[PDB]
Design an enzyme around this catalytic site. Structure first.
Site, PDB file in Angstrom:
ATOM      1  N   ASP A 242       2.582   8.767  12.280  1.00 35.05           N
ATOM      2  CA  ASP A 242       3.928   9.315  12.016  1.00 35.05           C
ATOM      3  C   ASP A 242       4.398  10.439  12.964  1.00 35.05           C
ATOM      4  OD1 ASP A 242       4.107   8.650   8.361  1.00 35.05           O
ATOM      5  OD2 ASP A 242       4.133   7.319  10.119  1.00 35.05           O
TER       6      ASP A 242
ATOM      7  N   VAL B  85       0.813  -1.224   0.000  1.00 35.60           N
ATOM      8  CA  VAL B  85       0.000   0.000   0.000  1.00 35.60           C
ATOM      9  C   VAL B  85       0.848   1.277   0.000  1.00 35.60           C
ATOM     10  CG1 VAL B  85      -2.099  -1.059   0.939  1.00 35.60           C
ATOM     11  CG2 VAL B  85      -0.414  -0.057   2.505  1.00 35.60           C
ATOM     12  N   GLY B  86       2.165   1.112  -0.083  1.00 33.32           N
ATOM     13  CA  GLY B  86       3.064   2.244  -0.243  1.00 33.32           C
ATOM     14  C   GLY B  86       4.087   2.417   0.858  1.00 33.32           C
ATOM     15  N   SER B  87       4.664   3.612   0.914  1.00 37.37           N
ATOM     16  CA  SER B  87       5.702   3.900   1.887  1.00 37.37           C
ATOM     17  C   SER B  87       5.089   4.280   3.225  1.00 37.37           C
ATOM     18  CB  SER B  87       6.602   5.033   1.391  1.00 37.37           C
ATOM     19  OG  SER B  87       5.917   6.273   1.455  1.00 37.37           O
ATOM     20  N   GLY B  88       5.815   3.970   4.291  1.00 38.46           N
ATOM     21  CA  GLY B  88       5.551   4.528   5.609  1.00 38.46           C
ATOM     22  C   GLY B  88       6.847   5.158   6.070  1.00 38.46           C
ATOM     23  N   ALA B  89       6.903   5.561   7.335  1.00 44.17           N
ATOM     24  CA  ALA B  89       8.115   6.159   7.878  1.00 44.17           C
ATOM     25  C   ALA B  89       9.167   5.086   8.154  1.00 44.17           C
ATOM     26  CB  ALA B  89       7.800   6.960   9.138  1.00 44.17           C
ATOM     27  N   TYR B  90      10.283   5.176   7.428  1.00 48.27           N
ATOM     28  CA  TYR B  90      11.435   4.274   7.576  1.00 48.27           C
ATOM     29  C   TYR B  90      11.162   2.820   7.162  1.00 48.27           C
ATOM     30  CZ  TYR B  90      12.533   8.276  10.700  1.00 48.27           C
ATOM     31  OH  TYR B  90      12.694   9.525  11.260  1.00 48.27           O
ATOM     32  N   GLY B  91      10.250   2.635   6.212  1.00 46.52           N
ATOM     33  CA  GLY B  91       9.899   1.299   5.725  1.00 46.52           C
ATOM     34  C   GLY B  91       8.659   1.292   4.853  1.00 46.52           C
ATOM     35  N   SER B  92       8.410   0.174   4.185  1.00 45.72           N
ATOM     36  CA  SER B  92       7.251   0.077   3.307  1.00 45.72           C
ATOM     37  C   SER B  92       6.118  -0.671   4.005  1.00 45.72           C
ATOM     38  CB  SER B  92       7.625  -0.583   1.982  1.00 45.72           C
ATOM     39  OG  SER B  92       8.101  -1.895   2.196  1.00 45.72           O
TER      40      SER B  92
HETATM   41  C1  LIG Z   1       2.061   0.372   9.795  1.00 46.79           C
HETATM   42  C2  LIG Z   1       2.419   1.639  10.538  1.00 46.79           C
HETATM   43  C3  LIG Z   1       3.302   1.557  11.618  1.00 46.79           C
HETATM   44  C4  LIG Z   1       3.656   2.701  12.336  1.00 46.79           C
HETATM   45  C5  LIG Z   1       3.122   3.935  11.967  1.00 46.79           C
HETATM   46  C6  LIG Z   1       3.461   5.206  12.696  1.00 46.79           C
HETATM   47  O1  LIG Z   1       2.635   6.106  12.623  1.00 46.79           O
HETATM   48  N1  LIG Z   1       4.602   5.323  13.398  1.00 46.79           N
HETATM   49  C7  LIG Z   1       4.993   6.550  14.105  1.00 46.79           C
HETATM   50  C8  LIG Z   1       5.480   6.169  15.500  1.00 46.79           C
HETATM   51  C9  LIG Z   1       4.074   6.723  15.310  1.00 46.79           C
HETATM   52  C10 LIG Z   1       2.242   4.016  10.884  1.00 46.79           C
HETATM   53  C11 LIG Z   1       1.883   2.874  10.164  1.00 46.79           C
HETATM   54  C12 LIG Z   1       0.934   3.019   9.015  1.00 46.79           C
HETATM   55  C13 LIG Z   1      -0.395   2.588   9.148  1.00 46.79           C
HETATM   56  C14 LIG Z   1      -1.288   2.729   8.081  1.00 46.79           C
HETATM   57  C15 LIG Z   1      -2.616   2.315   8.186  1.00 46.79           C
HETATM   58  N2  LIG Z   1      -3.449   2.456   7.139  1.00 46.79           N
HETATM   59  C16 LIG Z   1      -3.011   3.016   5.982  1.00 46.79           C
HETATM   60  N3  LIG Z   1      -3.855   3.158   4.927  1.00 46.79           N
HETATM   61  C17 LIG Z   1      -3.396   3.782   3.692  1.00 46.79           C
HETATM   62  C18 LIG Z   1      -4.371   3.334   2.598  1.00 46.79           C
HETATM   63  C19 LIG Z   1      -4.112   4.150   1.332  1.00 46.79           C
HETATM   64  O2  LIG Z   1      -4.283   5.542   1.626  1.00 46.79           O
HETATM   65  C20 LIG Z   1      -3.358   6.039   2.594  1.00 46.79           C
HETATM   66  C21 LIG Z   1      -3.527   5.287   3.916  1.00 46.79           C
HETATM   67  N4  LIG Z   1      -1.722   3.425   5.862  1.00 46.79           N
HETATM   68  C22 LIG Z   1      -0.859   3.297   6.887  1.00 46.79           C
HETATM   69  N5  LIG Z   1       0.474   3.742   6.739  1.00 46.79           N
HETATM   70  C23 LIG Z   1       0.913   4.334   5.467  1.00 46.79           C
HETATM   71  C24 LIG Z   1       1.371   3.596   7.818  1.00 46.79           C
HETATM   72  O3  LIG Z   1       2.553   3.988   7.687  1.00 46.79           O
END
Ligand SMILES: Cc1ccc(C(=O)NC2CC2)cc1-c1cc2cnc(NC3CCOCC3)nc2n(C)c1=O
Length: 344
Positions: free
Chosen positions: A165, A27-34
């Protein structure tokens, strides 16, 4: 006991996850990982699984890995992303190399909802209320987002929102990565407080109300000029507070401008929304409305409940001022993974 793991290739990398997680899809990028979407067969929930990319390659990486896990393990609030699971395929500390983080899967982010169009006042009320409720909680733990924007506000079908994030923080040009930032941090004016996040909320609220970016600067200077045109140039009092002599000197060079009329900027908007915006978009961070204070504003009368806006338990972040070796950060992280207990 330890679950059985299965291996799979996803983002040019081998993901090894417990059997309970099925149908993994990027579902794409997150902070410091996919991040991958998945079905948790144990709970029947759709979940988001983030694999941290090289979590222990440097002191910086190892500490930030520990930082994220500690943050996620602590946060237990409806409007703040929570930890459903954290796992490693490693059977010991010496094998320990990968960290996976599991949260709820949200349907979209706030960008997807905006889509060049205005939203109704009640929808704006509900969305911003939830952001501030989540921020009250986060800020009560002495954690700051520092980079709040529509792309880290995740929302489901029924407009229930969670903040992603926080506590962790390409800033060049015409980019949404800088459009929501408080000027004091954009131009490094001083040591910045929690209300940097309230500036961001104001920027986001204006955008939901108008369907347009409030301060779409083409660069740092252009954005500052857009900001000051609206809120006015800083007074002598704020100028003194700008601890950066360099930043202060540039600020004083600018032709003085008065604060504009927000009612003439946000035509047709609820006068209460306009009032709240004026209290959020204040140049002096010392004078900006706080999340706790904002929740009590008349704009949220139909949602505000003083008994249902909780604060966080004490959060020990003494580690932030600690100097440790990679293996020491790594071991602290491992302890946190092993001791994890899933939410009810
Ligand atoms: C997996 C995870 C782990 C940690 C954190 C985080 O916030 N860490 C900092 C310390 C607080 C964020 C996530 C996280 C969850 C997530 C949930 N749903 C969705 N749904 C996506 C659908 C498509 O549209 C955009 C949202 N995208 C997400 N993403 C991208 C994420 O990064």
């Amino acid at each position: 006991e330890r679950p059985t793991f299965y291996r799979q290739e996803l983002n040019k990398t081998i993901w090894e996850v417990p059997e309970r997680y099925q149908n993994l899809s990027p579902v794409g990028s997150g902070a410091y990982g996919s991040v991958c979407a998945a079905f948790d067969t144990k709970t029947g929930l759709r979940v988001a699984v983030k694999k941290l990319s090289r979590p222990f390659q440097s002191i910086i990486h190892a500490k930030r890995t520990y930082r994220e896990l500690r943050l996620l393990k602590h946060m237990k609030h409806e409007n703040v992303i929570g930890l459903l699971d954290v796992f490693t395929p490693a059977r010991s500390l010496e094998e320990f190399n990968d960290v996976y983080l599991v949260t709820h899967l949200m349907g979209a982010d706030l960008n997807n909802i905006v889509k060049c169009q205005k939203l109704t006042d009640d929808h704006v009320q509900f969305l911003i209320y939830q952001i501030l409720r989540g921020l009250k909680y986060i800020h009560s733990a002495d954690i700051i987002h520092r980079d709040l924007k529509p792309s880290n506000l995740a929302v489901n079908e029924d407009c229930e929102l969670k903040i992603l994030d926080f506590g962790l923080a390409e800033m060049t040009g015409y980019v949404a990565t800088r459009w929501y930032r408080a000027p004091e941090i954009m131009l490094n004016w001083m040591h910045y407080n929690q209300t940097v996040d309230i500036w961001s909320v104001g920027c986001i609220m204006a955008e939901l109300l108008t369907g347009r970016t409030l301060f779409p600067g083409t660069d740092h200077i252009d954005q500052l000029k857009l900001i000051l045109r609206l809120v006015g140039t800083p007074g002598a009092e704020l100028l003194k507070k700008i601890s950066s002599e360099s930043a202060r000197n540039y600020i004083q060079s600018l032709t003085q401008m008065p604060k504009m009329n927000f009612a003439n900027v946000f035509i047709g908007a609820n006068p209460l929304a306009v009032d709240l915006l004026e209290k959020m978009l204040v140049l002096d961070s010392d004078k900006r409305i706080t999340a706790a204070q904002a929740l009590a504003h008349a704009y949220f009368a139909q949602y505000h409940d003083p008994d249902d806006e909780p604060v966080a338990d004490p959060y020990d972040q003494s580690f932030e001022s600690r100097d440790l070796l990679i293996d020491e950060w790594k071991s602290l992280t491992y302890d946190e993974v092993i001791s994890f207990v899933p939410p009810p």
